[PDB]
Design a protein around this ligand. Sequence first.
Ligand SMILES: CNCC(=O)Nc1cc(-c2ccc3occc3c2)cc(N)n1
Length: 337
Amino acid sequence: VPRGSHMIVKNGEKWMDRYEIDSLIGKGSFGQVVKAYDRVEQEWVAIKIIKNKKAFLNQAQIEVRLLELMNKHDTEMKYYIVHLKRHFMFRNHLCLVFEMLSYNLYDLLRNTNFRGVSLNLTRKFAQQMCTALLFLATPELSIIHCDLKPENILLCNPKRSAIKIVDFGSSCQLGQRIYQYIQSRFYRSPEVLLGMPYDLAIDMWSLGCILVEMHTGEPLFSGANEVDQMNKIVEVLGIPPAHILDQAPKARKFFEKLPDGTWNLKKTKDEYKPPGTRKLHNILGVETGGPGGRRAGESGHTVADYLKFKDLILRMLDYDPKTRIQPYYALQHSFFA
Ligand SMILES: CNCC(=O)Nc1cc(-c2ccc3occc3c2)cc(N)n1
């Protein structure tokens, strides 16, 4: 019986006279993902090997349940989610076999030297991701991904724009609270930072942050910690509405109520641009040739195009989860006309 939690996986070995292990795709907290040739079906597969650890096995069984639940819907919208082919136990690990995909949107950014992809490619990713979130919002699913980031969105094919969402290991359904901390820090919604109730709208917040990053090459809100995260959000979007902060268990982690009932930023221990002064209009370079002016004198990057993109992003980055744009309405936006 092995001591480590990780499965020993030797490149070139063959599992169950079926799966020819080629290479490691990536390692994580959960375990690893290996590229393997399925000799029975004659196709490449990504095998997700879960660590022999109770927390990770629990997460993986939830991910299996949610993926199988999505599998039974007929809609074309379901193909924006990675397809789980099968799962089995092997050398005492849960193994999930997925369709082989290409590299992730962070790798795509690194291949641009973090200068960003075109607004035309950003629009394509945006439409597919809004369609995927519409699928998760199906009432019988009502799945909150809770970890949307460039690394969990993968190209199907390296030469094409088709994408899929992977990793439902931190996911839950509408009304559940399972994990102390949720969302990757850069992509973490205000409601989660403020310890407030969360629904499917937190995934739309993450998408808004991701889409700006895909076009600029840099994270919109790159917090070192939760206080820095909230402060960088405030630089762009201003002090959150009073009706939110007044109900927020963790309002006083970031803000203080003054005697008039108005909220300001909490004092530092002892740096940020004033609230609302880091305008998204200028981050995107709407009037100034796009990010760093590098898009002036390309097509598909007009002021008209940028204004529609910014308007949609700011609807996705609404502080109020009740009024934040929902996938159904985002798809009708003139940005997609
Ligand atoms: C490191 N981030 C975690 C992670 O890789 N998770 C993950 C990855 C994959 C997956 C599926 C197909 C793939 O083709 C190439 C890589 C790859 C990963 C699927 C699921 N459900 N979760």
